[PDB]
Design a protein around this ligand. Structure first.
Ligand code: SF4
Ligand SMILES: [Zn+2]
Ligand SMILES: [Zn+2]
Ligand SMILES: [Zn+2]
Ligand SMILES: [Zn+2]
Lengths: 356, 130, 752
């Protein structure tokens, strides 16, 4: 029964994954990461302290966010002494944000938090953003009280008018404003206010936010974005960079003005034209054509082969069939591949192998 | 101002004490600044005025503000009003220049669960060769 | 949805329905069909008013009888909430049935709550408002104006405008709440008060407070218009006895008697002034009195008696005037001697308790005032006052108290006791003697209600134990039961704290209120809970004085300063307007997210109708058992009367009285099953009171929470708050706590 207990738990876990449909998602994103650094964050519920762990997870989130969203930009804000402090301008450089967070890791948190101040700063920082981008705000709230100079309700209404989206991660309990902020800002959806239940659960919540959020049907904006694909060039002598004005061995050449840049993907400093590589767009393709989840094969029927199609792993004999088939191509797979094919890869080998 | 019972024994300061009477006027002015009609839902004034001819035994001294031997108020009720006024001022300061009852009474949990209105896109795959 | 009962179709105003609501409706229909009284107890976390209205409204519309509905509440604020549910209920019926069925439903309240006159609604007391309204609506001003247009007496445009239109056309068909009624009346310059009074006989459902059904002063006029077979609903009747007792109670002080003599002398002077110039009025009144007519046959419908009948309609004598008080001058002498007799009885040096018969016997000895003439003091005074042209009655106001006292004492003799105390307040430099007429039997004023009406439903959220109420109030019930909420996941955490973090017992005993050890322990509890409470926290104290003293102790100690950092402190005050502002600020603070903590009295104005659903109430801190003041003559006399009559132990009643109030506040935090909160009872005496709590609260109280410490309790609260925050699994409540139409049909099939 112990082995069956694990199997049934896997089925329950697979129950949520069954319902997958290609929802429209905004690949281009503009995130404003807000961290709470107040007296309430000095507690020891999270070892060594809330501030240390949150900063540590923030660095991991930055690494993950830019890895799967190469054509996105992020900004970092912090609440301290009842005021909102800006620590990094919105930019596409992952290193800049990580460096800023590392410096923040030293200063001790103190004072009270001010959501209205943080939201107001986020609203201003997101004002110079193209309409084709999705404006998102990730707030890490730990305090159960908010001290603000003005009316928070007015700011929430302004946030809705600006088509901003807010995600709040709590630490202790539910806050009335956070629920209202996460509800009115997300078309009444109540799934954008999450409270962690332990140290491990917090890691999943940060990882979940990486995936682009689906867009609402009524909030439909379609437009064409002008972009360019620079060609990498190797130079025998170092030359000045158009971005930092420093000696570098070489850089990508913009196809619109021939101005060189250090690293990609970034907007050209001269023609203000977003420069990217073919790989950068390719990564976000899986969010557009998600691989249909595999359905477990009942043991009543007869299996095709005793070994996995993609990894040639003999299926254990052991109650419950250890095989998962793909409806599109009807190819059995072991448990290990399905996790690997839906988390690392995003293409079913069986479907590709089938000729037409 | 700190919401503490003033002690007659305390000497205080002669210069500052001149403004004590002014503060009493300020509190009266502040009381009007906060006074305004209240919704009938949380209107406690009407509860006692619902039957204006109620005649009954007077409440015991435990249900009335404390008084001293002379019969006058001990003054601890004043600090309660002072603290109460201070809280009201802070909230009002937030709402600076910078139907509803029906919705509140309704039970949200009994309503239909929120339904997502996300869009779905199907993309065709066909293009000319290089 | 619209589901069916055995023969009654009912339209629920929500797509879903709780299992308890369906059981609630079925039992209520059984009570109505079988007839008689019933007592029903529901958890506060399930919609009770909406469920009750849906069935009752359907019952009237379906059966040919079309019995009217009477809804009784305990406060005006509750009337507003009930009307909102009716307005929501009618909207659903109109949208589902395709038409607005013929229905009329209006609330009711005093003039002060419905006066629109620019110069009369700005008064701080309802008595003055009634007097001013009477002056412009008695009819003397209208009659005087007709005879002489030059008369400076004014009228009320709102009242006058009503005469143009018929009573049936005062308001359009539908349901009008106070908020909506005022708006409609303002746009047309009409008096909501008079409209409500003149439409009771035509309203399908009438909603008013208990004081309008039990108090003889104001209930007689209203009760005379309602039907005899109408349905009666007692909503939140767990404190009905207190309302019943105060209806037939009175207080007399030395100042009241002192002001009574001045009015009596003024009344005598007025008679002489009228006698010299216009003596025909006295003869006209005297001529009518000889035959045996009373105020009803003399006073017109437009006008009302100056002194409201302090006794029930069934207990007033119908005989003619005895003759002693038949004349104006003679009655004043009768009244004057009575006032002096009361004054000489105010000099006693020790507490005296005597029955009404003993008081009458001593009165008949020292003076020669008989019982029968004393019963018509109030009745005779109204006739004399009316005929004396006393438009200004500022001086004669005090005489109302004397007239009220005479009628009450001379009417009832069993279950009533008279208390004379030489010291109203023991903490006083000079004696301030008071005279109190107390009512001991709690069934006297409610007896007519249970006899006039056939079917009566008594329902409340914390009415337990159910067996005691039939004992206290002499009535029988066909069925009495309490429903337990079938919540899939625990939503409320009731726990009992008996000692502080230092393992020292904590109690709210009055004698040790200024205890340095207990004050710190309670102060630590307040601060620690305020640190973890997300939005709002309500603190209920046994009495205002105990709260007043302890709060001052915290202020000096500095406990409040710590609380100020995390939440705003709102304090209940004796003034009603100031307390209302505090609630608005408290709600506003909770809404935005600043956080606020409200300190109130368990027996105060906040606990008698104000609700703290969802964010407003997240943690309730009951500071001690709300015990009454044991060393009170009024309570002691009541306790002895119950023990001898109903064989109820004094300790048992005292525990029941305190628990009924402690439970009352606990139920004002949950509205639906999506609400959550923690109920902490901070006293060592709560440990043995688990059985006395409401069933739906007792079931949620674990055996391990009977005796907890501050440190242990805080940790449990933190865990509970965190766990409830997680998203609830829909499947865990698809058909176990919440029912859809399909689920309801399935239950109706399995049951049948
Ligand atoms: S008639 Fe109505 S509006 Fe006029 S004074 Fe009386 S209560 Fe007020
Ligand atoms: Zn560079
Ligand atoms: Zn360029
Ligand atoms: Zn495999
Ligand atoms: Zn496949």
């Amino acid at each position: 029964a112990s082995l069956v207990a694990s199997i049934v738990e896997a089925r329950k876990k697979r129950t949520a994954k069954k319902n997958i449909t290609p929802y429209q998602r905004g690949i281009i994103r503009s995130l404003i990461l807000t961290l709470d650094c107040s007296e309430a964050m000095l507690e020891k519920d999270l070892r060594p302290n809330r501030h240390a762990m949150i900063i540590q997870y923030a660095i991991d989130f930055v690494h993950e966010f830019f890895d799967q969203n190469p054509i996105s930009q992020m900004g970092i804000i912090i609440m301290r002494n009842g005021l909102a402090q800006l620590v990094s301008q919105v930019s596409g450089n992952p290193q800049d944000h990580i460096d800023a967070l590392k410096s923040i890791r030293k200063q001790e948190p103190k004072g009270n938090p001010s959501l209205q101040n943080a939201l107001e700063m986020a609203r201003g920082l997101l004002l110079p953003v193209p309409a084709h981008c999705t404006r998102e705000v990730l707030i890490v709230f730990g305090s159960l009280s908010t001290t603000d100079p003005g009316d928070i309700h007015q700011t929430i209404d302004s946030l809705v008018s600006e088509k901003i989206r807010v995600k709040v991660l709590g630490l202790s309990a539910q806050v009335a404003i956070c629920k209202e902020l996460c509800k009115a800002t997300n078309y009444g959806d109540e799934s954008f206010y999450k409270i962690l239940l332990d140290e491990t659960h917090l890691k999943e919540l940060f990882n979940e936010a990486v995936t682009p959020l689906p867009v609402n049907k009524i909030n439909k904006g379609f437009t064409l974005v002008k972009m360019g694909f620079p060609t990498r060039i190797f130079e025998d002598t170092p030359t000045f960079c158009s971005c930092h004005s420093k000696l570098v061995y070489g850089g990508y050449f913009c196809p619109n003005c021939h101005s060189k840049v250090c690293s990609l993907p970034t907007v050209c400093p001269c023609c203000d034209l977003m420069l990217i590589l073919s790989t950068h767009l390719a990564r976000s393709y899986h969010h557009l054509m998600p691989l249909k989840t595999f359905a477990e094969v009942p043991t009543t029927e007869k299996f095709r082969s005793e070994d996995c199609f993609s990894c040639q792993s003999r299926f254990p004999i052991l109650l419950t069939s250890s095989r998962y088939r793909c409806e599109d191509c009807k190819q059995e797979f072991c448990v290990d591949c399905d996790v690997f094919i839906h988390e690392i890869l995003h293409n079913c080998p069986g479907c590709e192998s089938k000729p037409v | 101002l700190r919401g503490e019972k003033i002690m007659q024994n305390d000497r205080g300061d002669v210069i500052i004490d001149r403004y004590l009477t002014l503060d009493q006027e300020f509190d009266r002015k502040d009381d009007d600044m906060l006074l305004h009609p209240v919704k009938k839902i949380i209107d406690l004034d009407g509860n006692i005025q619902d039957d204006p001819v109620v005649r009954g035994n007077r409440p015991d001294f435990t249900m009335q503000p404390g008084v001293d031997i002379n019969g006058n108020s001990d003054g601890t009720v004043d600090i309660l009003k002072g603290m109460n006024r201070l809280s009201e001022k802070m909230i009002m300061a937030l709402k600076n220049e910078y139907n509803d009852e029906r919705n509140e009474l309704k039970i949200d949990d009994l309503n239909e669960s929120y339904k997502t209105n996300y869009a779905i896109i199907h993309l065709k795959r066909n293009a000319h060769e290089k | 949805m619209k589901f069916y009962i055995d023969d009654l179709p009912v339209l629920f105003p929500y797509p879903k329905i709780y299992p308890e609501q369906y059981n609630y409706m079925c039992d209520i229909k059984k009570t109505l069909d079988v007839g008689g009284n019933s007592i029903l107890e529901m958890p506060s976390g399930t919609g009770k008013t909406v469920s009750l209205l849906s069935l009752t409204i359907a019952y009237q519309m379906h059966y040919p009888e079309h019995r009217k509905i009477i809804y009784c509440s305990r406060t005006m604020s509750e009337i507003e909430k009930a009307l909102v549910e009716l307005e929501n209920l009618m909207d659903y019926r109109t949208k589902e049935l395709g038409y607005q069925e013929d229905f009329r439903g209006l609330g009711l309240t005093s003039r002060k709550n419905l006066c629109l006159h620019p110069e009369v609604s700005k008064e701080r007391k309802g008595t003055v408002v009634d007097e001013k309204c009477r002056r412009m609506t008695n009819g003397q001003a209208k009659r005087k104006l007709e005879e002489d247009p030059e008369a400076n007496v004014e009228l009320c445009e709102y009242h006058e405008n009503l005469y143009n239109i018929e009573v049936e056309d005062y308001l359009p068909k539908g349901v009008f709440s106070f908020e909506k009624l005022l708006k409609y009346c303002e746009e047309k310059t009409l008096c909501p008060y008079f409209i409500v009074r003149r439409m009771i006989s035509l309203c399908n459902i009438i909603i008013y407070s208990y004081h309008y059904l039990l108090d003889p002063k104001i209930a007689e006029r209203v009760s005379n218009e309602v039907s005899k077979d109408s349905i009666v609903i007692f909503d939140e009747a767990h404190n009905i006895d207190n309302v019943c007792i105060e209806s037939l109670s009175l207080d007399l002080t030395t100042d009241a008697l002192r002001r009574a003599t001045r009015g009596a002398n003024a009344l005598d002077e007025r008679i002489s002034e009228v006698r010299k110039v216009d003596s025909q009025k006295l003869q006209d009144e005297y001529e009518k009195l000889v035959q045996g007519l009373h105020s009803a046959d003399i006073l017109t419908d437009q006008e009302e008696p100056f002194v409201e009948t302090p006794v029930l309609p069934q207990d007033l004598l119908t005989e003619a005037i005895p003759g002693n008080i038949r004349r104006a001058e003679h009655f004043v002498s009768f009244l004057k001697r009575l006032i002096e007799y009361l004054k000489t009885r105010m000099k006693v040096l020790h507490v005296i308790s005597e029955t009404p018969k003993s008081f009458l016997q001593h009165l008949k000895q020292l003076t020669f005032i008989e019982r029968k003439p004393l019963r018509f003091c109030s009745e005779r005074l109204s006739l004399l006052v009316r005929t004396l042209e006393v438009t200004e009655v500022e001086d004669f106001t005090a005489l109302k108290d004397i007239a009220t006292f005479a009628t009450l004492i001379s009417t009832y003799e069993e279950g009533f006791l008279l208390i004379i105390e030489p010291y109203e307040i023991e903490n006083a430099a000079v004696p301030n003697p008071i005279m109190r007429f107390t009512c001991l039997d709690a069934s006297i004023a409610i007896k007519p209600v249970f006899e006039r009406f056939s079917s009566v439903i008594i329902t409340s959220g914390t009415i337990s134990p159910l067996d005691m109420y039939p004992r206290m109030l002499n009535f029988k019930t066909v069925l009495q039961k309490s429903y337990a909420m079938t919540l899939a996941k625990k939503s409320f955490l009731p726990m009992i704290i008996t000692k502080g973090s230092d393992q020292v017992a904590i109690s709210s005993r009055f004698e040790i209120r200024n205890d340095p050890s207990i004050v710190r322990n309670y102060g630590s509890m307040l601060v620690e809970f305020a640190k973890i409470t997300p939005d709002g926290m309500v603190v209920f104290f046994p009495s205002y004085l105990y709260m007043e003293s302890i709060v001052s102790m915290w202020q000096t100690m500095g406990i409040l300063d710590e609380v100020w950092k995390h939440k705003l402190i709102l304090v209940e005050t004796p003034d009603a307007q100031e307390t209302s502002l505090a609630l608005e600020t408290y709600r506003k603070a909770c809404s935005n997210g600043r956080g606020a903590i409200l300190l109130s009295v368990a027996r105060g104005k906040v606990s008698e109708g104000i609700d703290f659903d969802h964010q407003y109430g997240r943690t309730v801190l009951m500071i001690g058992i709300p015990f009454q003041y044991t060393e009170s003559r009024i309570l002691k006399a009541r306790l002895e009367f119950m023990r001898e009559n109903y064989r109820i132990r004094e300790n048992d009643f005292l525990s029941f009285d305190a628990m009924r109030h402690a439970a009352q506040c606990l139920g004002r935090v949950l509205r639906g099953k999506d609400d959550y909160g923690v109920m902490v009872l901070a006293d060592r005496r709560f440990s043995r009171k688990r059985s006395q709590l409401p069933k739906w609260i007792a079931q949620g109280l674990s055996d391990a929470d009977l005796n907890l410490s501050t440190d242990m309790a805080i940790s449990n609260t933190k865990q509970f708050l965190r766990t409830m925050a997680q998203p609830t699994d829909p499947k865990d409540q698809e058909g176990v706590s919440v029912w859809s139409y399909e689920d309801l049909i399935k239950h109706q099939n399995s049951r049948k």
